[PDB]
Every structure is written in C-alpha cells, then in structure tokens.
Design an enzyme around this catalytic site. Structure first.
Site, PDB file in Angstrom:
ATOM      1  N   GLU D  98       0.851  -1.188   0.000  1.00 29.01           N
ATOM      2  CA  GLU D  98       0.000   0.000   0.000  1.00 29.01           C
ATOM      3  C   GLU D  98       0.889   1.242   0.000  1.00 29.01           C
ATOM      4  OE1 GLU D  98      -2.821  -0.575  -0.578  1.00 29.01           O
ATOM      5  OE2 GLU D  98      -3.497  -2.389   0.432  1.00 29.01           O
ATOM      6  N   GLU D 128      -3.974   4.829  -1.452  1.00 25.58           N
ATOM      7  CA  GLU D 128      -2.904   3.975  -0.951  1.00 25.58           C
ATOM      8  C   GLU D 128      -2.386   4.491   0.390  1.00 25.58           C
ATOM      9  OE1 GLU D 128      -3.281   1.536  -4.522  1.00 25.58           O
ATOM     10  OE2 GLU D 128      -3.233   1.430  -2.344  1.00 25.58           O
ATOM     11  N   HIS D 131      -4.962   3.046   2.663  1.00 23.20           N
ATOM     12  CA  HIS D 131      -4.700   1.620   2.808  1.00 23.20           C
ATOM     13  C   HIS D 131      -3.499   1.338   3.696  1.00 23.20           C
ATOM     14  CE1 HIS D 131      -6.948   0.855  -1.255  1.00 23.20           C
ATOM     15  NE2 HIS D 131      -7.720   1.366  -0.314  1.00 23.20           N
ATOM     16  N   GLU D 193      -2.473  -5.657  -8.720  1.00 20.71           N
ATOM     17  CA  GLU D 193      -3.840  -5.480  -8.254  1.00 20.71           C
ATOM     18  C   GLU D 193      -4.844  -6.332  -9.029  1.00 20.71           C
ATOM     19  OE1 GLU D 193      -3.621  -1.148  -8.899  1.00 20.71           O
ATOM     20  OE2 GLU D 193      -3.663  -0.869  -6.716  1.00 20.71           O
ATOM     21  N   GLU D 227     -10.595  -0.318  -4.745  1.00 22.89           N
ATOM     22  CA  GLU D 227      -9.850  -0.928  -5.841  1.00 22.89           C
ATOM     23  C   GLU D 227     -10.365  -0.751  -7.267  1.00 22.89           C
ATOM     24  OE1 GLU D 227      -6.020  -1.883  -5.758  1.00 22.89           O
ATOM     25  OE2 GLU D 227      -7.386  -1.588  -4.067  1.00 22.89           O
ATOM     26  N   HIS D 230      -8.467   1.826  -9.094  1.00 20.16           N
ATOM     27  CA  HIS D 230      -7.099   1.458  -9.426  1.00 20.16           C
ATOM     28  C   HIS D 230      -7.033   0.548 -10.638  1.00 20.16           C
ATOM     29  CE1 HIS D 230      -6.309   2.124  -4.839  1.00 20.16           C
ATOM     30  NE2 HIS D 230      -6.993   3.100  -5.407  1.00 20.16           N
TER      31      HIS D 230
HETATM   32 FE   LIG Z   1      -4.268  -0.360  -1.978  1.00 20.48          FE
HETATM   33 FE   LIG Z   2      -4.706  -0.354  -4.983  1.00 19.28          FE
END
Ligand SMILES: [Fe+3]
Ligand SMILES: [Fe+3]
Ligand SMILES: [Br-]
Ligand SMILES: [Br-]
Ligand SMILES: [Fe+3]
Ligand SMILES: [Fe+3]
Lengths: 387, 166, 510, 511, 388
Positions: D98, D128, D131, D193, D227, D230
């Site tokens: 992260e 991130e 996270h 990811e 997510e 991302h």
């Molecule tokens: Fe993440």
């Molecule tokens: Fe991510």
C-alpha cells in the site's frame, strides 16, 4: 482475564447452539419494513418518517391519532396531557407535516457538528493569517461588540419562545421540527457571543463581557421595539402555533432578515469584516432551512388543509396582521442605527433597496401563501419613516 | 565487532571521513569509493555489506564541504569538481544518444552515476540526467528482449558459468 | 498571530446573562414551586459542542450496526423470546423518550435561570435522539430479524393490549401532566435516577446473554447521555429547595411520583427480564432490592437530604407488594396473549427449576398452572383454549386499576390482593392499592382513563384484533402468539371460532 | 430565481481536463520508453472534496465497528492462534505494498500529461495512503487487543530479520517504483492489483472469517471498495500509450517481466498463507491459483486488452508448471528458518496432513515424513537443541536465495522446480532459480544487486543476528518467533545461542 | 437462507469451541502497543505516529532507516528506489518530522468532507437567500470570472509541483504531509472553478467555461511572471525538498498570500462579494495548516538538525534567493491588476501597506528561520515598480 467472565449468546458455543436450535426456518413475516403503514410523502418511505411518524401516543380525538381513549393521568383540573385546546388551528391530521430536509436527530447533529469543527478551524486560520489587521476599529469596537452583540438577546428571546411549543406540539413531526428551529436560534445567539469572545482573544482591549450589548438591548433605543415584540412573542403567546408562525413567518422573516442580511451581512464587508459574515452565513443557512419546514407546516399542511383550508388561512391572516405591526415598529427603531454609522457608509437609496428585498421576499415566501394582502410600499414607507 | 548496523568497517570509515577537511580531497575520495565499491562494475566486492552506508557518510562530508566552499551560483550549477553541471549533462546525453548499442549505453549510464551522483553534481542536473539517460538505455535494452538465447546472453554479458542444473 | 479559537466553556461563561427581566417573564405552567433564577447547571455546553459530542457517538453506533453487526447476522442470531421482548422494550421505552421531550420542554419553560433552561434544553435534544434510537432498534429488528411483525408496527398495534395503558401512565402522562415539578420527579428524580438509568444497562446485559448485540450497541450509547438528566433532576430540587412551598409540597409529590413509577416497573420489568428471555442474568427480586432500596432509596435519595428530601413514605409498602408482583402479572399477560403485539412462551423445564430455586413456592402456584394450560393445549390452535377462559371458569376476575392501569387479579394473586370498588356519579372505579386510591379520591378529574373492558365491552375478541390491525402480512395470522415456534401460528379465525366476548368485570357488583 | 442551488463534483470535473496548459518543459521527470496520450480521460469524475466525503463515510462504518461492537465482542482475542500469527505477516507485508503504491502513483501522476489521467492516479495516491494506515490499524488493533502483540507491534523493524521480507519488497516495494513508469504500472495495477491483490483481499477476509477473525474482514472489505478506481488506472495506462509506436515494441515485454515478477513471489507465498497459516481451510490453493491467474486474469482481463496489443505473458506456462508444489516447497524453508521470523509457526497437524495428501497426492511421502522427522527430533521443544536448519546441513540440502526475486529455494529437495544456475561476474557469485529471472539479471545486472541474508549474516551466530535486530519479546529473553503456536514452552534467545548455528554463504562452495 | 451458508469462527459453535480451546491463558506478551519503539514527539505516542512512522522500508544507508541492504530492484542504470541522491538536504533522521496537526488519512478526509458538505449547504442557503443581488456586476464578471478564475491555474500548477515529491519523499511522515499539501492545492483550484460554476447557475449569461480564465493565465500580463514562476517550480525543479520548500516557504508565502489575502479577500467585500471570501477562507485555512508542517520539516527538523543545521540553512538560504527573484517578478506583474479596478477602490498606500504585511509575515514565519537577510523595503519597492 483475556476471555472475560461474561458469556455472550452470539459467540458462546453452548448458548449460541441453544439459540440457533430455537430459530425458525425463515422470518415469521415477510414485511420487514418498520412504519410500512405510514403514508409516504415522497416516492418511498424515508428513514426520517419511519423513525418519527406516530411516535406520539395521541388517540383518535386528536386529528390523526391512532390510539384510543383518554390519557391515563392529566393535570389537576382536567387538562389533557395533549389536546386540541392548546391551539386555535385545526387539521384533518397533525401528522401530515414533513420537514423537507427530513431531519431526525442523527442528520441534525451531524451537520451542526461539521459546522462547529469547521468553525474552530476557520477561527484558527483567521487568527494565524492575521486577517484582523484589515478590519475597521470603530465597526469592531462599536457595531459588532454593541449592536451585533445586542442582537444575540433577540435571537435568544426567539429561542425561548419555543419552550411551550416543545411541550404542547401535537405530533412528533411537528415537535422535532420545532425543537430544531429553536435550537438553531440559541446556537446563533451563542455564535454571536463566540465572535465577541474571539475578538477579545486577538484584540488586546476588547471586552467579551455581555454587559455592554445587554444594556443596549435592555435600555437602548435601536432595539427597544425589537425587544418589546420579542418579549411578547415569547411570554404573551400561549398558543404554540401562533408562537411558531408569528416568529418565523412574520417577525424574524422581516425584522430578523433585515438586521442579519440587509444590515450586518451587507455592511460588515465594507469595513473589512469577513469574520461576522462567517457566522451570519450560518444564521442564514439556518433561516433558509427552517423556512422550508415552516412553509410545509403552515401552508402545505394547515393553510392548504383539505378541510380547514379557509379556516386556518383566516387565523394566520389574523396573526400576520396582529404581529406585523409590532414588527414594523421594530424595524423603525432599528432604522436609527444607520444615523450612527460613519459618513458615506450608505444612502437612503440603498436601504430602500434592501427594505424592498426583505418585504418582497416576505410576500413571496409567506404573505401570498395565506392570501394576506400586504402593501410593500406602505410597509417600506412606515418603516423607512424611522431614519 | 561484526554487527549489521554497527561494526569495525563502518567505524573505521567514519574516521577516514572525519579526516577529509577539504572539498577537493573529499570529493575525489567519494568518486574513488564509487569506482571501487559500487555497481556490478565495482573494482571489488569486499565492502558489499557496508558500502551503501559508508558512501552516504562520505556524501554527507562532501555536501557540507561543498556548501561552505561554493558561492550560491556554483552550488546550484557546478559539480564538486568545478565543472559546469549543464555542460556535463548535455555532453553525457549526447554520448548516450550516439550509443550504437545497449552495451555502450549501459556503460555510459552506469559510469555517469559513479562519477556524478549528487554530492558531486547538483541534484537537479543529475536527476534530469537520470530521466534522459535511463530512457535511451531502456529503449535499447528492451528491443527484442527475448531473441538472444540464454546460452549466448551469458557469453555477451561475459559471466563465468559455474554451474547449471535442470 | 498564534492559532486561536473559542470553546464551549468560554461562551457558556456568559450564558447566565442571556436572560433579561421584564413584566411577564415567568413560566406559563401551573406550579406550586419557584425555581431560583440564579440556578446553575453542571455541564457548560452550547448547541454546537452538544451536537459534536452526540455526532461522535452516533458514528460508532451506526457504524457497528450497518457494518460488523450486519455482516455477523446479529439481527437474526437472537433467541426467539428475546426478539419478541425487544418489540416491547424498545417501543415502550420509545414513548418514554418521546414524552420526556415535551416534559423537559416544559421544565425548560419552568426554569427562569438561563443555565437551568440550558440544562433542560440539552435533555430535550437528548430525548429526541433516544426516541429515534429506540425507533431504530425496532426498525433494525424489523429489517433483519426473525419476526418483523410488531417491531414494524408497535406504534399502532400496542393500542390493542392493556399493558400499554400502564406504560403511558409512567412514561407519557406522568412525565407531562401535572405540576412541572411533579413531572420532573416522575421523570428525572425517580424514573431516570431509580429505574431508567439502571434498567437500560441491565437490558443490555439480558440482551447479550440472549444473543442480542443490537440493543447493547444502541442502549449503551443512550446510557452515555443519562448523567446530564440525573443532573437536571438533582438541580430541579436545588432550584426549589429555598422556596417555602418546598417544605410543604416536595415530599408528597415525590412519594406520589415514586409509587407511580414503581407501581408499573416493579411487575413489568421483572416480567420482561425473567419471562421474556431464555438465559437469565440475575433474579429480579435481587435486582429490585439493590436498585430501589439500596442505590436509589438509600444512597441517591440520601444525598438530597440537606434539601429536605425524605425517602418515600410508601417505600415499605412497595417492597411488600413487590415479591410476587411480576410473577402474578405474567399470568394475566399470557392469559390475554391475543391482545398483544408480541409472541409469548411458557417456561421450559430448566426455567421452572430456575424459578423455583430463586422463588420458593413458584412451581406449586404458577408452575402447575402453566403445565395445566399447556397440557390443555393453550399453544395449539386446534384446542380452542385461551387461558382467559380458565380465569372465567375458576371465577378469577381481572381488574384494571383506575389510576395506574395495571391489571390485577385479587382472588388468584400470591402478592397483593386488596381491592376497593367505588361508585361516583354513575361510574364504577376499581383500585389495587391505598396510594392510588387516595390519588383518585383527591384528584378524580386527573384519572378518567377508560380501561380495555370498558372500551371493548360486548365486542368479540377477534373483532377488536382485526379492527386494530393485530394481523401479519398475510392478513390472517395473528401478530401475537401463545408460543415462539415457527409452526402452528394462531389465525384470526382460530380466535373468532371461540366467540370470546368482553365484559366489564366491575358490573358484577351491581 | 431564488431556488436552492449548488454544484457537484461532475460539474467541476467537466472542466478539469482544461486545467493543464502547454509550455516547453511541461513533461514527465521520469525515464520512460512510452508516451502517455495528452487527451486520456478518467472513469470516475471526482474532485478532492467529494473524494474525501466518500472515503470519510467508509471510515465511519469501519472504525465504528472496530471501536464498538467488535471490541465489545472481544473479537481481537477469539481468533485461532495460527491466524493471529498469519495476520502479522499478511497485514504488515500488505502495508508496504500500500505504501509503495503511494509513491508508485505519484510517479504515474507525474508521467500522465492529460489532467484527467493525472487526477485518476491522484485518487489512488490518496487511497494507498488510506490503505497504508488501514493495514497499520489491523496490526495496531491485534497488538492492543489480541493474544500475542509481539510482531504485530514491531513488524516494521522485526520483518527485517527474515528472508521472506526481501521477496515481498521486490514485488510490493521496488517492483512498484523502480523502472519505467509503465513497467511499474504493470507490476502494480495491471498485474499486482488486477491479478493478485483484488482477488487476494477478498480471499483473506473469507479465510479470516473462517478462523474467527472479524477485524480483518471489517478493514479489508473497506479497502476493497476503493480498488475499482485502481483497476481503471491500470487499464487507462495501457489505453494512454496504445497508439504510440513504442507500445508495439515494448509493452508485452514489460508486461511479461512484471507478470513473472509478481507470480514468482505470490504463487508460493500466498498458498503458504492460506494452507499453512490457518486451522480451518476454505479452498485448495492449486485450484484457487488456476482460477485467479489462468482463467480470470490470464484469460478474461488480459483478453479485454487484446485490442491494444496486449498479449498473454509468454512465461504463463512456465508459471503454471512451477506453481503446483511451490508453496509446499517454500513452507519447508520458512519453518526450517523459523528463528528468523516475527511470527509463530506450527507444523501441519494430523488432520491437516490428510487434507494435504488428499488435495496434493504425494505430499505425505515428501513433506509429511520430513515434518514427522523434525517433530521427532524435537523441533517444537526448546530443550531438544534442534532447529530444522541442522537437518538441512546434515543432509547436504543447501538453501539458495534467488538474486533477482529474493525467493528462497532448495533445489536438491524441492518437488517443484529444481533448476539452479550459478554465475560468476566481476568477482561476485550469483544464483538463479529460473530462466526468466536469469535473463533479467544478465540484461540488467545493475538493477539487481540485493545482498541476501547469507551474504549479510555470513559468519554470524544465529542468536546474535536475532538480538541485534530486536527479535525479542518485551521480557528481553523470549523470541518473538516460535516453532509452535502453543502458550507454553516458548523458545528463548539462550535456547538458540546454545545451538551455536553460524550462517555461511552456500555459494562459496562453488570453485 | 435466513442464517446463510458461510459459517463464521466467531459465532459458529463448533468452530468457536475449536478456536477457544487453542487459545493461551493470557497474552504471550504484555506490550500491546504497536509502534512502542518509535520515539514520541510529544508526551505520549500518538495514533498518528504509530500508524505512520517506519511504514517506509528504508535501510540504514538512508538516514534513520531501520532495514539493511540494497533495494531488491532498482531503475535501469542503477538508480535506487529511494536514495540520498534525490535531494540536496541532509539530516540525521528523515523520520523526525511530525505534522503538528497529526493528520493521517482518516482525520484528513474527515475534515475535508465536513468542509464539502458545509460548502454545499452554504451555497444552497446563499442561492435561496438571494444574496447575489447585492454583488457588484463588474467585480463579478470581470474580476471573479477572469482574474480569480485565472488564479486556479496558479494553484493547479503548485499542486502538480508535488508529483515528483510524492514519489521521492524519503520518509512516511514527509510523504503524507507532502501529499496533503498538494491535495489541498488541487482542492482550492477546484473550489475556484466550483464558484464559477455556481455563479453560472444563479447569474444569467455567466459562462463557467474556463476558456477566458485560461486565456488570461496563459497569455495575459497580470499573471505572466506568476505563470513563469509556477512552470519553473513545477517542471525545472527535480529536487523534492527544493520544490516543497520553494513553493510553500517562498512563492506561495509571498505571491500566493498577496493574491488570496491582500487582493481578493481584501477587495471582494467592498463589492458586495461574500461568496469568494467563503472559498478563500478555506484556502487560507489550508495555507495556515500546511505552514505548520512546512515549518516543522524545514526549520525544526532540517534547519535545526543537530548535525546538518548549518548546511541545510545554507542550502535553503540559497533556494530562497533563487526563488525570491521570480516571486518578486510575479508580484510586480500582478500590480498591473490594480489599474483595472474601478476608480477609488484602493490606493497606492493601501497597496503598499498590504505588500508589507505579506513581506513582514514572511520574514517572521520563514526567512528569519534560516537567517536569510531579507530587506523588506527593498522587496516592496521592487514590486511597486509594477504599479501602472
Ligand atoms: Fe491499496
Ligand atoms: Fe490499490
Ligand atoms: Br374476551
Ligand atoms: Br544459521
Ligand atoms: Fe432518554
Ligand atoms: Fe433521559
């Protein structure tokens, strides 16, 4: 200990096994919607309605009530806990009212809490940024401290006018809205003092004591008629609806909106004062919020009541006239304050423009709702005759 | 004393560094250290476990000495060796753009790092260099990346194949 | 230019001066006392800080409910009996929270000192939060539980049964009808300080034991607000301690307030705990003694001595009538199960042993009765038997106290069996105790509440139920049930076929 | 008109693309073979204010559950010992991923020239960071409320003692930020990811629920909601460079390298996570892997990008062939080196071996017997004077560290890959375990100079390394790491010192 | 089903009993504090610190790192993932920095979210209250739309200056602060556009298109040097500390504060504009919040570094001189804007006094902290030359 001595039925193997064993195969009723029997104001039932509508245990003899029979305990003499006798207004159902903003407790304190924290952050930035340096000393030490401060007693008085209504309201939806209208009022009063306490911290000789602004309110001439009207709306009215209607649809809509918006919100900026408008922004945001609820109750519900439409309008038109005079007087006395301003601050052409805004906005949002025929020119004229 | 974060080699070098009290001597020693102990082309792997930490300590000394010896303009635009940073950057990029293959390109990039890494060349010019040199190196290296068989790649790289299992 | 701001206390410091003198600056409500306009409050809050402190609590609470608790299926993995119990506990408490709003709004009007008004005001807002919180509990169990019926409509289905009347006397009318101070004693000095405060925590205890993690999440949050209300109640006595009228009227309003509150909660709370659950936490008799006698009656009331407050003169009387009160009441509640908005269950073997162990003599009276009713088929719709028929057969009249609305059966009760019947201007009145009798004799116009027998007289049971919507979604099955199993639920027809018709029990004296 | 009006995010975003302007030096500061298109757009039309609100709403629910109900339920304690240990590694190792993704997307934000694409990466930069703090919170919560805080409370420094950490840094730290921004984007978004993280995160919450852990599901399920943005960034990276001649020349190579890099570590480590780090199982790694990497990612996801020139990684087949025993082969090593970790490990119990053999025929005859032997040697008992390493010494089974991936391998004992390539270059020895990493090193020698544990610890007595890097509990004696997950008979620093085990570089045996 | 198919270890009887049986009698260690090894800045370790410090996996060769050894994978050419070579500044520990407001992600988005929702409420109240009626039309259509609007590009540029820093920052605490400083800048740029969009909704004929403000920024004169400075700070600076320091402790502290506070916040009120000040309040709050972090990093941690104090001040003094010239140029061009205002709006004395406020605040809050010898009257006279 690490596990604790108390066994909980959700996690304890033994207890949970028993619970699980007693559970039915499926829910014993497919209708999992609480308040399903309430008639939605909008497309689908809102959380606001479900959690609020019918919380008040009124019996059917109070228009809308779902219960039956008399109260279990009454006042010495026989007065009912709640009853039709506490207000002149009549309706086919006191539970019709709906706050357009749909505010139950949670959303309400959430919004106010956000404002409190952003307010603290704002003050911290303002002080660190040295923005006070560009504010006019006289406007600060005289008009903000004395005259704006004195207005806190006005908002405080309007707050207190809600106490009886907090007790007499005939429905949950109306009681919640009412409480929130009054709570926002004392909040404003407290924000006025907050600003004076803030100035005292960043401006060396500034005194936060309410001594000065209070004397101005209790003895001054600028707010004399303002204070008289407030003392009346508060302690002379024993009808919770006349109180709420007269304060939000007559007095504060005229006098209040003029003092807050057309005077301090309009002139403070000219003295390099972005501080006061920061709090007035809240008072106006609050005013406009309450307004939607006041309109829905007295117009959408009562004024347009399927059975007492004409009746209520008559009572509200009566009330509008009853308090419009004390309100006109309040504005008149307030007009004296302009003469105290420094030369070139404003001209009669401007004030007249602002007065018509207050009045035209009033007739547009309130007066024309109950078919009250008010003359903008005569009103502005009567008020404008106080300079 | 053979620790990971603290040991005799490190202490010894801290002393050698405390004895650099002139920019030219210290800067020269830093560059020599990089030729001797950094990159796969280092002259020796004897300081493999501590060179990274020691290099930093040497850099600290060169930076301090350069800031004290250079006027403001030279600190921004000259290398610790007195060279015009922009000239060096442009000259190196020119050499890179003329590189005939990935083998020549890697020598240029790696050599540039060993000679001019920051305490030597101002950071702005150095990272501008990383930006341009790195682009061409990759462009040459990643073209037909898998065509050359491992058998032949080991030969091009010039490794000594010690043991193979499969 | 150092970062600066202003906190709640710094503004509150000038709050007392907010109020100003003028002709009609007085309370609009009838009262025998005078609250000193110099009275202060314990917590120096302003609207904005108040909002923030409550917002933070809401955050955690709704967070747990919407997330982890829902993922754990917490609304379901609860014992059936407790799911039913919460229909009553949450909704009945809800009305107490709701009327407490008006009550504190009335106290806000009574207080003359700005600070005291501010104290009550904070509670006005808290009770609104509690109203919505109790509402949310039912809303959540309705949405994610094993039986939404009742949870989803208690606001209207509670009007069918007799126990709701008694609740309105202690948590609705007792809170707002009468001298502002009498109301304050019913709500804060007695209601909250003696019952509510302790009750709420005990409820989370019983809920946890029965698999319910929803109620603890919400009720423990409600509990964090109570210290402010205790303070308001305490400051109410301080506000009037100097007024001469106090030495003459306080202790009487307090006694009446105490009797009023205990009259309902002593039997009803013990009933909900011991009979509305599977897993037990503690015998009600033990809880009651500690709560009412020790903590409140002793420790709490003792601290108000210097203000001329004495322990209710009706305390000894309350303790005497308390022992069997809840056991006596459940017999009636179960016998009248069709009038509820929740499903009831008879004690299983383990429970009967628990009851006997903790209440010697329980089995020989209540135990045998329950087994008699069950063997007779009170749980089976095909039996054609509802326990009320047993009361008729054995001539055990069920009366409704004219004052408290609490149901009582003198000929069967193991507890109090006194009964006083009077006629006045063409109307009969039944009383269950000497305190309530005095209240009526002296204040006849305060107590004219019609009882279920008077309103339902001559009506066939299934007709009252149908008219008041005591049915489930299928429009045929009753919300109320004499058992908590998922099969063999009683329908409106199962009731209609019995032809049970209501009679006013008092007319037998004609 | 005096009606209530306002402005939302989409309304402002409509003009965001126009925020960037032209000027000579307006170009990325990072080396790259690719050209990200100037008019690239982003999927979610967010502005800073609205981004903060939607995440704030999530936090409320999350922290509300953690501080209230879950704490009241003692959820921090009522979890299987093995899982409490597994979460020390899963949460802290994920934390570094992260964290580096923060720098990774800052670098992509710099690379993007279109304001909308920059804005898309920006949201990820902030996500991130969220996270990082979320994963940190999990270890923070278990340390404060769990059965064993050691490791949960200092992983940021005690992770440095072990070899599994090195490999984690390759795929989730350096692989995310060191190289062509596009190569980094492939390791992070298109592979990391899209292939591993998104599916992994959900799987962890399921394995966690199974072992009584409701803390991780509460946090990780919240991470998962972010997510989608991302995935879109990874997808847009490819779109932004698709119409550049360079793409046809370099895209698939960077993608293949990124794929091998990610799988090289996750294939064996994740299976080790799920099967050896838990009591209750959910699914066999073998099938989980084939569905994730082969069907889902290598088939559907990668297939959607075929229109941009994206092909299936050429090393996919080798990855599948090597995958089968990978995690079993690695746990043998992780357990053998248990004194170098910051978590407690347990041998497969009787019941578990049945599962392994059932799901992986031939498991018992190899791993099963070995574990049985080690337990007989007293590997769980402190007084035994035995640690599995010794067994490797006695049976001449050297453990090597892949110079590129950092993944430990023992070719003379593995049932999976047994390849070993040893090269000497300019005075240094290098050991590889596969043909893809070997090429990476041969072509990019200066990118891979990571010192391995044997090189750094060479000549050091085991307990000394452990003590220097603070691998001890608060009593300053008992080791954080343990060869069993029971509450009694925990090994101490002295128990290890007595063994007098000294590290040696296995590659030095070669002449 | 009502109970569902998946059984959970915390609530499933069989599974929970297995779990409970394997549990130890008490925790295997009494130190239940994550981050116990981190040196607290304040009395006790904060959540902010525990959740942040040491998240960055630096080895010891990067001042303050706890790991060891080289990175596992570096850039083609050999550049390390993170390294000392990416900034001229040196320190004994890159992890010493602490955001005085202790902002980790949760508190950060919490506050911004509050500001968002309150902003929406304010706008709805402002529109419904018709407060737009009293705003001077010229100020609105000329100065707010064109000139305040053009400033969004300035803030947008400063936001982008942070991209390389987000990638190169040498520690978690610096990366987080850096990321938040940049995010607040993009937010401000978006709030400027938000106001224009709001105005287009309640003012007939108002064009929310950015064409005009953008043409002003890219080709006008008032912001010419400002734009040249931003283009340089953003794209010609490859040192993440030079960027953050020069942006926040030089350019924005002088030019930014003058434009936001001494021009728009100061004059908007005189034209009946309470709308722009509402947003500028947010921008100034953000500015003052970032300042605390900027000061802690460059002055408390680097400028006062026990080992590199002298070195770091020399470098920052260097950067201040390098960027003060372009900053003065930016302010000087901006002076051209005063000639555009309606006569009698303000005069040379007010303008000069306001310049001194910004310069004096800057000397006190930034320059003096590194012993930079700023001459306030020399700076102001250079700027005033731009007055037409
Ligand atoms: Fe993440
Ligand atoms: Fe991510
Ligand atoms: Br009947
Ligand atoms: Br060893
Ligand atoms: Fe309450
Ligand atoms: Fe209360």
């Amino acid at each position: 200990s690490m596990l604790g001595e108390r066994r909980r039925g959700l996690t304890d193997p033994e207890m949970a096994a028993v619970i699980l064993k007693a559970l039915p195969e499926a829910p014993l009723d497919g209708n999992n919607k609480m308040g399903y029997f309430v008639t939605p104001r909008w497309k689908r039932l809102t959380e606001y309605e479900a959690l609020t509508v019918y919380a008040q245990p009124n019996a059917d003899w109070i228009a809308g009530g779902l219960d039956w029979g008399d109260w279990t305990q009454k006042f010495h003499g026989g007065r009912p806990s709640w009853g039709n006798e506490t207000t002149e207004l009549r309706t086919v159902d006191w539970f019709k009212h709906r706050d357009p903003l749909r505010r139950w407790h949670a959303p309400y304190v959430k919004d106010k809490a956000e404002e409190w924290r952003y307010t603290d952050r704002f003050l911290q930035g303002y002080s660190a940024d040295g923005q006070i340096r560009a504010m006019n000393p006289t406007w600060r030490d005289e008009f903000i401290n004395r005259y704006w401060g004195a207005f806190l007693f006005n908002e405080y008085g309007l707050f207190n006018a809600h106490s009886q209504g907090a007790r007499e309201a005939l429905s949950d939806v109306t009681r919640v809205s009412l409480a929130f209208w009054g709570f926002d009022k004392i909040d404003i009063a407290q924000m006025i003092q907050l600003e004076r306490g803030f100035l005292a911290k960043i401006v060396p000789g500034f005194d936060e004591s309410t001594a000065v602004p209070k004397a101005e309110w209790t003895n001054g001439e600028v707010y004399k008629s303002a204070r008289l009207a407030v003392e009346g709306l508060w302690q002379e009215v024993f009808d919770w609806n006349e109180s709420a209607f007269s304060v939000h649809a007559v007095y504060d809509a005229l006098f209040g909106q003029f003092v807050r918006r057309e005077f301090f919100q309009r002139l403070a900026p000219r003295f390099g004062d972005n501080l006061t408008p920061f709090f007035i922004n809240q008072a106006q945001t609050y005013f406009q919020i309450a307004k939607q609820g006041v309109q829905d109750l007295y117009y959408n519900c009562l004024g347009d009541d399927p059975e007492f439409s004409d009746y209520n309008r008559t009572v509200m038109r009566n009330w509008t006239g009853k308090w419009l005079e004390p309100t006109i007087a309040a504005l008149r006395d307030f007009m004296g304050l302009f003469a105290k301003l420094p030369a070139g601050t404003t001209d009669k052409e401007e004030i007249t423009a602002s007065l018509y805004r207050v009045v035209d906005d009033w007739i547009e949002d309130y007066a024309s709702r109950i078919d009250f025929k008010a003359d903008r020119d005569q009103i502005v004229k009567a008020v404008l005759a106080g300079l | 004393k053979l620790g990971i974060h603290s040991n005799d080699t490190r202490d010894a070098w801290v002393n050698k560094i405390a004895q650099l009290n002139t920019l030219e001597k210290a800067a020269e020693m830093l560059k020599q250290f990089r030729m001797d102990h950094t990159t796969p082309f280092r002259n020796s792997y004897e300081l493999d476990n501590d060179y990274l930490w020691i290099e930093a300590k040497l850099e600290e000394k060169v930076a301090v000495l350069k800031a004290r010896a250079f006027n403001e303009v030279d600190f921004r635009h000259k290398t610790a060796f007195g060279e015009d940073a922009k000239s060096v950057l442009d000259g190196t990029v020119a050499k890179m753009n003329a590189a005939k293959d990935k083998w020549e390109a890697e020598k240029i990039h790696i050599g540039f790092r060993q000679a001019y890494k920051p305490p030597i060349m101002p950071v702005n010019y150095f990272l501008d260099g990383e930006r341009q040199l790195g682009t061409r190196l990759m462009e040459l290296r990643n073209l037909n990346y898998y065509d050359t068989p491992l058998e032949e790649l080991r030969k091009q790289r010039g490794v000594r194949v010690v043991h193979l299992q499969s | 230019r150092a970062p600066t701001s202003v906190n709640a206390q710094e503004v509150h410091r000038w709050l007392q001066s907010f109020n100003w003198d003028f002709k009609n600056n007085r309370t609009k409500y009838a009262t025998k006392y005078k609250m000193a306009n110099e009275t202060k409050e314990q917590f120096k809050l302003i609207a904005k800080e108040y909002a923030r402190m409550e917002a933070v609590k809401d955050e955690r609470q709704f967070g747990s409910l919407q997330d982890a608790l829902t993922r754990l299926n917490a609304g379901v993995r609860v014992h059936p009996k407790w799911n039913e119990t919460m229909k009553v506990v949450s909704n009945f408490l809800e009305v107490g929270e709701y009327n407490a709003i008006a009550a504190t709004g009335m106290l806000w009007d009574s207080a003359q000192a700005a600070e005291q008004k501010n104290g009550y005001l904070a509670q006005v807002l808290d009770e609104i939060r509690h109203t919505h919180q109790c509402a949310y509990v039912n809303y959540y169990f309705a949405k994610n539980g094993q039986d939404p019926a009742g949870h989803n409509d208690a606001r209207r289905t509670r009007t069918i049964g007799p126990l709701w009347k008694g609740m309105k006397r202690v948590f609705s009318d007792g809170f707002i009808s009468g001298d502002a101070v009498e109301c304050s004693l019913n709500l804060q000095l007695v209601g909250e300080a003696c019952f509510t405060n302790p009750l709420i925590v005990a409820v989370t205890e019983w809920a946890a034991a029965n698999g319910d993690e929803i109620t603890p999440t919400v009720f423990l949050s409600i509990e964090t607000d109570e210290l402010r209300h205790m303070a308001n109640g305490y400051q109410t006595v301080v506000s009037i301690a100097n007024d001469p009228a106090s030495a003459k009227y306080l202790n009487t309003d307090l006694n009446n307030a105490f009797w009023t509150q205990q009259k309902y909660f002593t039997p009803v709370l013990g009933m909900l705990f011991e009979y509305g659950s599977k897993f037990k936490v503690e015998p009600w008799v033990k809880t009651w003694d500690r709560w009412v006698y020790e903590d409140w009656g002793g420790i709490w009331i003792g601290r108000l001595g210097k203000y001329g407050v004495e322990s209710p003169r009706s305390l000894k009387d309350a303790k005497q009538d308390a022992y069997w009160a809840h056991h006596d009441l459940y017999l009636l509640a179960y016998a009248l199960w069709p009038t509820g908005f929740f499903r009831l269950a008879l004690p299983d073997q383990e429970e009967m042993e628990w009851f006997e162990a903790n209440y010697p003599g329980w089995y020989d009276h209540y135990g045998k009765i329950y087994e008699e009713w069950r063997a007779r088929g009170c749980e089976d719709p095909s039996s054609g038997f509802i326990p009320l028929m047993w009361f008729i057969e054995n001539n055990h009249p069920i009366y409704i106290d004219r004052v408290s609305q609490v149901p009582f059966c003198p000929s069967l009760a193991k507890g109090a069996s006194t009964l006083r019947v009077h006629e006045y201007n063409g109307e009969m009145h039944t009383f269950s105790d000497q305190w309530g009798e005095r209240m009526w004799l002296a204040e006849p116009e305060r107590y004219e509440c019609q009882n279920i027998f008077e309103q339902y007289e001559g009506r066939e049971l299934s007709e009252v139920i149908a008219e008041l919507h005591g049915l489930r979604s299928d429009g045929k099955t009753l919300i109320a049930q004499p058992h908590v199993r998922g099969d063999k639920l009683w329908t409106l027809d199962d009731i209609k076929r019995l032809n049970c018709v209501f009679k006013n029990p008092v007319k037998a004296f004609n």
